[PDB]
Design an enzyme around this catalytic site. Structure first.
Site, PDB file in Angstrom:
ATOM      1  N   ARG C  54       0.813  -1.176  -0.058  1.00 42.70           N
ATOM      2  CA  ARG C  54      -0.112   0.007   0.043  1.00 42.70           C
ATOM      3  C   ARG C  54       0.765   1.217   0.073  1.00 42.70           C
ATOM      4  NH1 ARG C  54      -3.983  -1.864   2.860  1.00 42.70           N
ATOM      5  NH2 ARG C  54      -6.016  -0.816   2.677  1.00 42.70           N
ATOM      6  N   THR C  55       1.869   1.377   0.766  1.00 44.70           N
ATOM      7  CA  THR C  55       2.750   2.332   0.761  1.00 44.70           C
ATOM      8  C   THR C  55       3.792   2.411  -0.464  1.00 44.70           C
ATOM      9  OG1 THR C  55       2.901   2.645   3.267  1.00 44.70           O
ATOM     10  CG2 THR C  55       5.007   3.261   2.191  1.00 44.70           C
ATOM     11  N   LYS C  84      23.694 -10.401   3.450  1.00 45.21           N
ATOM     12  CA  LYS C  84      24.514 -10.879   4.917  1.00 45.21           C
ATOM     13  C   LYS C  84      25.784 -10.858   4.134  1.00 45.21           C
ATOM     14  CE  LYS C  84      24.020 -14.268   7.984  1.00 45.21           C
ATOM     15  NZ  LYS C  84      23.491 -14.786   9.474  1.00 45.21           N
ATOM     16  N   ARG C 105      12.446   1.943   2.536  1.00 45.08           N
ATOM     17  CA  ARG C 105      11.554   1.263   3.931  1.00 45.08           C
ATOM     18  C   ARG C 105      12.597   0.132   4.189  1.00 45.08           C
ATOM     19  NH1 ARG C 105       5.639  -0.695   6.210  1.00 45.08           N
ATOM     20  NH2 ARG C 105       5.063   1.264   6.109  1.00 45.08           N
ATOM     21  N   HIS C 134       8.007   7.394  10.406  1.00 41.95           N
ATOM     22  CA  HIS C 134       7.135   7.221   9.106  1.00 41.95           C
ATOM     23  C   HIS C 134       6.772   8.708   8.678  1.00 41.95           C
ATOM     24  CE1 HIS C 134       5.038   5.427   6.018  1.00 41.95           C
ATOM     25  NE2 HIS C 134       4.345   4.691   7.023  1.00 41.95           N
TER      26      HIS C 134
END
Ligand SMILES: Nc1ccn([C@@H]2O[C@H](COP(=O)(O)OP(=O)(O)OP(=O)(O)O)[C@@H](O)[C@H]2O)c(=O)n1
Ligand SMILES: Nc1ccn([C@@H]2O[C@H](COP(=O)(O)OP(=O)(O)OP(=O)(O)O)[C@@H](O)[C@H]2O)c(=O)n1
Ligand SMILES: [Zn+2]
Ligand SMILES: [Zn+2]
Lengths: 310, 153, 310, 153, 310, 310
Positions: C54-55, C84, C105, C134
């Site tokens: 959604r973001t 890693k 994000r 945020h």
């Protein structure tokens, strides 16, 4: 405006003969005289809740050859929406604030029609919803049939394979039954036969059909041979292997076919169409996959643009 | 107001009487069509004596006139039933149900992969073919099933 | 240049009252008079190391409605960077050679601020970093509060749900505390209460607040009701179920609300806001999700364009 | 006679009359204790005038004597209900409900992890009047909840 | 026949003082003289639908030390059961058709008690059901208190850790409340407090308890120090880490501990009890886990055997 | 030496009437007087390369009730075998180097019979090989028919469910055809019909069988009603659900059933036999699963033991 302008494209059952011809007419023009900045400034969302690389790339290339922008996703073991908590209805209510049109493919039937009740005036185009509908596949199959045979009626069409569960063969029979005089030959393993409802419909329209057992039985009268992949999981390994000398296609079998006969297949073809068929003139499944660009351009152009004069 | 009794209870002052409900359909019709969600006085008679059906149910809803298509939602469950509309102790109207073209809300799509199960949509079925026997098609998944199959779960 | 031009957007704590008003001012203009080729020739990178459909789609649609190009990824069980071995710092040092801005994000807190020390003069915009910040969610919440109430101060704001862990409610309280005269009502299960630091801050500013137990207690004096989802995993199933007759919202509860009262929710809403609320005038969470496009357009325009005269 | 009261109501000869059912619990009780799955005469009245204690509902079930245990389960719903048996045209016993030991079958564990949710089991909650409320403890998960949290879900 | 003969050991709340003393007196005799062939020819099912290695290996060695055969599965590692909607009522109705007792762990609360409605005359002993009970961990805890303190009454028992979600402290507080004059000290962060229904039961029985913040406040008076692990998901990283994470025992804290004091912990301990505590006389957590062998052997002996020769 | 001494029990088709009667007479004696030490010192391998919990737990309790040790693995949960191309011929050539009998389940058809070419003198008993055989489920089914009906001939046996893919109905029809005058009723949806090679074998032996659509047509005459589960992947959701899903038994259907009639089901039953059937005298599915303990103990006794003292 044009008749399909800003309309939802959910099922073949919902499009008249005339709507199917309008799409096929447009798509032949977009093929001939391309129009790259037609959807300049549109953002289309490509919500593939069920991955399908081949259908996804054909749609996105369609969005991009008409100049549209694209946001979206695919979801095999990934990216959060629908979740379990998040309803489809709220995913759509949110996404229909961001975009101008939604193309979606989902695993449960009617997911597209549910979307329609939540997208506001944003059109949603169904790219597959479980075992129910896949209109843009039927739209490109008919474009390929029209483009090769020159017409959509008075055709001798043979359909082969899993007729019980190929969603594309169910749709293509309803669609070819809006036109006149088509004769259908259905060659399937009787465990995988055309369901009585397609057949019961065909009878009310007075359309002629017959059921055969091998392609060899009809090779000679046939114009389109539409092959379908037979799905091993709904078969026993040993059932799958014991059917006759099969229902797979090889060039030897084609020595008989009419000059304008073409072999169509929605793809993937694993083994029912052998590699030697690919080099004959009758092979048309790759061309069929390229006409997907022109059928899906056409539907997008008519849905998002009011009057299209090309 | 007049005589009541129970073998065939009597006279409400204006409202609806659904008489000749099969038997054990009365409470279904109450549950399903939520006829009870009213502040008006309802009187209901369950397993009653009658001429031809022998035992039947009846529902009297005062001050509500449910009509035209409400009466048709009843046809799948109570097809031979009469819906008397009463104004001032006189039956100023008798309807019978007829098969509707859409039955909303009350049914459940038997197809487990239908999207309708999980969502804030109401069920809806197109109906077809009178009394040789009824097929219902889901709005959403577009699968057609026999009414007797939808009417079991 | 404009004050935010080429600035990193990492925390609300770093933006003054005036910076928040400049964003909200711009975003109301981009909403009114759209400017589709403003970031023509910019490539923005959408590095979602933590999936959030959604973001992600709201940002990418923002990038595309201003004409920018987009490269990037999401990573639930997939695509290699960070690995890693590969540090975040080297992922960023490499990516800041390719693009003009980075939206990212990430699951660990401060991942965005670390990025800032490696991106050269490439601005990085934080789309979430663990339980810390945020900012673009707080930016669209304030746009929706300003757009519905007409102002950002002298508001009676109620916040409900998981106040201990909703990152959005922590941010929105710091942000609404740069403006004047706001009264806060915090209705939370005492296991999930506003932490003493938000409260201790509110007291130095002299801001009034109170803690209530049910929305019913404040329904009448309230302008914004900001609902948060309560997170079952930090609760016992039986704890979750035994709180009062809850802190969920239904239209019955709204019969009392002021005419201009709106219900906001960052979404997803699983069950704390019932479907009947959606049809009342007070429902504003879907509109809130659409204003995300205008808040994120505004931030991108100010960061990448020097003087913006619209 | 006429201060309407009844309007010649269904004086049953022998059976159970549940009266002073507080309004809207009337239909609830029919559903939950499946009182209509019987072939005997029932006559129900919903949203009747309670000129004395509220507005009310009332079920009259003939040739049926619903007792002791049966009466006490109704305590959680219609605490204010008087059951009355009738054996030959008037009241033979008039019994109030008292909270029982246990409430079986009708009630759902609030706890979604309780095993009772997915299995062929029937609910049992032990009832405890915790002087303000009644706490109901689930047999299975042994979690204790306010009767109010249980009664929605 | 002994009172526990052919009983289902499903909850601590179902065992009386006398039942708890009998089990503890029988464990004491099997610890002193072995009975290696007492359950010879018995077959017991070890069904751990949720894996718990520590508890399985001890329950089965206990079965092996009394001479019984074990069949069974560990799962949550998809060993094909619950496959194609098989209910737990149906699994137990088939497993009790051929074993002599069922020992089971399951993720949902209530499951051993449901097994009981289906098992017939085969006893069901519960090895854990969700956040509800675990009688066998409480029986071994009680046995270890008795054997090191000489009594189960008049104890000063401190409970340290996450008291809100720790299933074992809740059961031991209810078992020790069966007995006389015990005194409780609860030392827990505010977020992980001992729940009110426990506290209310203690008040109603006139038993003395108190809250403390530091083990230092209470060390001197303490006979049993039962530590529990906090799981850091119950808090957030920074909460855990903050001034909250000092509910951890080191050797320097035991300075003033009574000569009889013991440190008990159900295990795994990760860092709440520092490794230097192990070399002290007071460390009794491993010896506590060895005592699980005789508490469980005694329960299996009393349940399958109608008369014991003590 | 008994005829089965040191035989491989791989297919029902390999056991004669006499072999089937011997096994069934030995099960009857071990059910009546136990022999708990008969396989003392024998070690048996339980190799389930495909997991099947129900069958494993019963085969191993059977081994445990005759006094043998069991070593072995359940897999399709990657317990490290088949690791680095080890063939099944090589796994069995190493496992038979130290166990006294191998019991195995495997996903491919033919695998127990291949184990036989590599095992030497260690007998191989098959617990299922793909869609081919499962002798031990047929032996327990036969035992349960004999013990409740008193005979294995002259029976009226109805087979209901998915007869096309149900491996157990196919083997029981071939075992009952060994015997005299049995009559068969097959009640299956059209898509899940009893295959022609079964039907042809029945005709060739002059045995009577017939197709019916409703159990009501046949209830009255029926002695054994063997129900099977339909797996809904063999059909599609709407097919299953449609007028096809009423091959389900409820208590009201058994109204006119003979006093001797029994309902048998290999299990898991999910919804084809409603839960209210369990309280009837006719429900014998659980007792059928208890009988799996003595059919398998008898096979293990006859195979490992050259002379039995009956
Ligand atoms: N004020 C009134 C008048 C009539 N009725 C109901 O109206 C129903 C039917 O109307 P009516 O034509 O008066 O009796 P019928 O001739 O039996 O109608 P039908 O033949 O359709 O059953 C009866 O059940 C009667 O109880 C009523 O409850 N209240
Ligand atoms: N043959 C009879 C006699 C009585 N009743 C019912 O039995 C109930 C019992 O009430 P009753 O003792 O007759 O007088 P009330 O004062 O109304 O009882 P209460 O004190 O509970 O109000 C009444 O509602 C009445 O309808 C009945 O249906 N048939
Ligand atoms: Zn449907
Ligand atoms: Zn419960």
């Amino acid at each position: 405006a044009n008749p399909l302008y800003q309309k939802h494209i959910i099922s073949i059952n919902d499009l008249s003969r005339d709507d199917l011809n309008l799409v096929l007419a447009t798509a032949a023009k977009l093929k001939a005289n391309p129009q790259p900045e037609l959807l300049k400034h549109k953002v289309i969302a490509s919500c593939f809740f069920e991955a399908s690389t081949r259908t996804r790339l054909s749609f996105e290339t369609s969005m991009h050859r008409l100049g549209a922008s694209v946001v979206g996703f695919s979801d095999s073991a990934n990216t959060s929406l629908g979740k379990k908590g998040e309803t489809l209805a709220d995913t759509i209510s949110v996404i229909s604030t961001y975009v101008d049109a939604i193309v979606m493919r989902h695993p449960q039937e009617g997911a597209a029609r549910l979307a329609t009740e939540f997208s506001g005036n944003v059109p949603v185009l169904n790219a597959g919803d479980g075992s129910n509908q896949h209109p843009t596949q039927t739209l490109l199959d008919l474009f390929t049939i029209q483009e090769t045979q020159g017409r959509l009626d008075n055709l001798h069409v043979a359909m082969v394979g899993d007729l019980k569960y190929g969603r594309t063969v169910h749709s293509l029979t309803q669609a070819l039954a809006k036109f006149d005089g088509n004769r259908f030959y259905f060659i399937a393993p009787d465990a995988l036969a055309m369901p009585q409802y397609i057949l019961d419909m065909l009878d009310e329209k007075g359309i002629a059909w017959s059921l055969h057992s091998s392609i060899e039985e009809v090779m000679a009268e046939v114009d389109i041979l539409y092959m379908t992949r037979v799905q091993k999981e709904r078969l026993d390994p040993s059932e799958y292997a014991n059917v006759k000398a099969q229902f797979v296609l090889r060039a030897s079998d084609l020595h008989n076919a009419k000059a304008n006969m073409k072999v169509l297949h929605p793809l993937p073809r694993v083994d029912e169409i052998a590699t030697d068929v690919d080099k004959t003139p009758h092979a048309w499944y790759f061309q069929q996959a390229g006409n997907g660009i022109f059928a899906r351009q056409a539907l997008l152009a008519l849905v998002l643009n009011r009057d299209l004069v090309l | 107001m007049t005589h009541d009794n129970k073998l065939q209870v009597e006279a409400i002052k204006r409202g609806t009487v659904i008489d000749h409900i099969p038997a054990q359909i009365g409470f279904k019709l109450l549950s399903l069509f939520k006829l009870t969600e009213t502040d008006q006085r309802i009187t209901i008679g369950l397993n009653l004596p009658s001429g031809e059906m022998g035992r039947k149910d009846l529902i009297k809803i005062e001050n509500t006139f449910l009509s035209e298509d409400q009466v048709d939602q009843l046809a799948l469950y109570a097809p031979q039933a009469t819906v008397n509309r009463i104004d001032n102790y006189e039956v100023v109207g008798k309807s019978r149900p007829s098969l509707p073209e859409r039955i909303d809300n009350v049914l459940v799509c038997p197809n487990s992969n239908c999207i309708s199960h999980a969502e804030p949509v109401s069920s809806s079925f197109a109906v077809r073919k009178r009394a040789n026997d009824i097929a219902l098609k889901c709005k959403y998944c577009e699968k057609e099933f026999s009414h007797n199959v939808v009417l079991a779960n």
